[PDB]
Every structure is written in C-alpha cells, then in structure tokens.
Amino acid sequence: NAMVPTHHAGNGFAVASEQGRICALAARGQRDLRQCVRAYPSLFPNPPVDDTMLSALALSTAFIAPWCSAEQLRVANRASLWVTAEDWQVDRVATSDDAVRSIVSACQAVADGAAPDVDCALGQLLAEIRDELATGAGFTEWQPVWREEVRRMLTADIREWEWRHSARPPSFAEYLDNADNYGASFVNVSHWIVTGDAQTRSHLPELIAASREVQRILRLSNDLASYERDIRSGDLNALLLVDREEVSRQLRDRIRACQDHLHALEVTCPREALYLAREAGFTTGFYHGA
C-alpha cells in the first residue's frame, strides 16, 4: 500500500475542474440540439426525445471532444440527432419493406446533393447537415467519403430491418459486421469534415477503419446495456447470438486491441486518435453505468 500515493486532493481538484468545464460546454451544446428538434418536431416525439435525452447526447459529444467549442460541436450533435431521427422513422414509422427502402433511397439522394422533398422532414434535416459540411469543410473532396458513410449506414439499416422479419437470425459475427447502423462512423466522419484539415483527409482511410473498430465496441457495449429493452421490442441484440460472457470478453479484448491501434495512429493523427479513444471510453463507461 505505500506505493499507492497518499495525496489525491491536488489531482482531484484538477480533474474535477476539467469535468466541470466540460459540463458547461455540454450545456452550451444542448442549445443547438433544441434548435434542431424544434425545426423538425415531427422527427423527435416527446415519449423518447426529452431534455434528458438531449442532455445525455450533449454530454457525450462534449466529453468526447472537449477541445471543441459548442459551435465546433454543432455538426457532431446534429448528425447524432439525425441518426436517432432516422432510426425512429425506420424502426417505428416504417411498416413495409417498401416504406423502408424509399426512406433509404430518399436520404441517399439528398446526401448525393439532391434537394429534399418538401414533405420529407428527415431529408430536410440531412440536407441541412450536408450544407453545413459544404460551408464548414476543412478540406475538399469530402463528399465521396461522407456519401459512403451515409450509404453504409443506410444499407445496414436495411439489413437489420430484414433480420427482424427473417426466418433465421444472423450469426454474432455477421451482426457485428453490420454495426454501421449504429451511426457512429457517420457522426465521426461528419465531425472530421468540419474540424479536420488536409492532413486529416490524407489519413481518412485509416481513420475510418479505426472509427469502424470503435463502432463495433460501441455496438457490443450498447447491447449489453440495452438487452432488456431489446427483448421488449423484438429488436436484435448481440446477447441473443452469444452469451453475456462472450460479449463481455470480446468487449474487453476489442477495447485493448483498438487502443493498441490508436496508440500507433496517434503518432500521425493525434487529435483523430484522441477523439476515437474518448468516444470509446465515454460511451462504454456511460452505457455500463457502474
């Protein structure tokens, strides 16, 4: 026990002071989330989307990238909201194989630059985000990268809708392969487009592979936390495909592998790696809620 420090108040003060500054940062970010729910209240019903949910969202993006101002976090926050609006339109609103695919097609069209249909709130919010990226981009030729993340996420949403209505569930491995429907990579790439530079662009392929590794971690941590809810709605959950012991051991090992990659990656992408490490850290700790 003598190797364990006797004094902790000094570091205690310093850590708590940064946690307090980030909580105020998150409160400032919550203001744009409210603005967004307001412009499109049809996407954000109350029974799910209340200021409690908006608070948790703003706390996550502030604690994931605490070096950003609230204005710099605008995109990450609205993209995160857009993912939850799109999830809802697909999981709850859609009632047909045809309904889901027209949503997907309409979003892809907007992501590719088409004007949103006037009756399509989901498409109008995406078009707003896309135009924010166009004005805010720190580098050119961001469009192919962003459209690809849109495509990957929407395609995976299709596959999950099919699984919920299919005769046989996917394997655990196949399910984890489908984690783009979580939307984390979509959010990360949106964030990096407005906050990165030319250096960011030349490292985008590696950054996106790391982002997809973190997203698999987030899917496992999400599902371990949401098992009861998922059971309740017939939604797919990793713990239906393997047991909690395998999910937890795999979470542990994936985290340790991912941090080894981030350790290498930070030599070239210090800000990028940090963003991902804090995204994996905050989200797994928050979802676990120990």
> Which residues would be at the binding site for a copy of itself (CB under 8 A)?
6-10, 12-25, 27-28, 30, 50-52, 55-56, 59-60, 63-64, 255, 259, 262-263, 265-267, 270, 273-274, 276-290
- Taking the complex as a whole, the smallest distance from the CB of residue 176 to Mg ion amounts, in Å, to 14
Nearer to a copy of itself, 208 or 255 (CB): 255
- Dist CA 69 CA 48 (whole Å): 27
Contact residues for 141 (Cβ-Cβ < 8 A; gap 6+): 201
Q: Could you list the residues that contact Mg ion (CB under 5 A)?
A: 87, 91, 181, 226
- Taking the complex as a whole, the smallest distance from the CB of residue 261 to a copy of itself amounts, in Å, to 9
Using alpha carbons only, give the angle 2, 5, 8 rounded to the nearest 5 degrees.
150
Nearer to a copy of itself, 106 or 280 (CB): 280
- Dist CA 70 CA 28 (whole Å): 6
248 token code pair: 């937890």
Residue 87 interacting partner from Mg ion, a copy of itself, none (CB closer than 5 to 8 Å by kind) = Mg ion
- Taking the complex as a whole, the smallest distance from the CB of residue 182 to Mg ion amounts, in Å, to 5
- Taking the complex as a whole, the smallest distance from the CB of residue 230 to Mg ion amounts, in Å, to 6
Which of 188, 248, 245, 236 is closest to 212 using CA atoms?
A: 188
Nearer to Mg ion, 88 or 139 (CB): 88
Nearer to a copy of itself, 44 or 161 (CB): 44
Residue 7 interacting partner from Mg ion, a copy of itself, none (CB closer than 5 to 8 Å by kind) = a copy of itself
State how far the alpha carbon of 131 is from the alpha carbons of 99, 108, 115, 233, in Å.
26, 14, 11, 35
- Taking the complex as a whole, the smallest distance from the CB of residue 119 to a copy of itself amounts, in Å, to 33
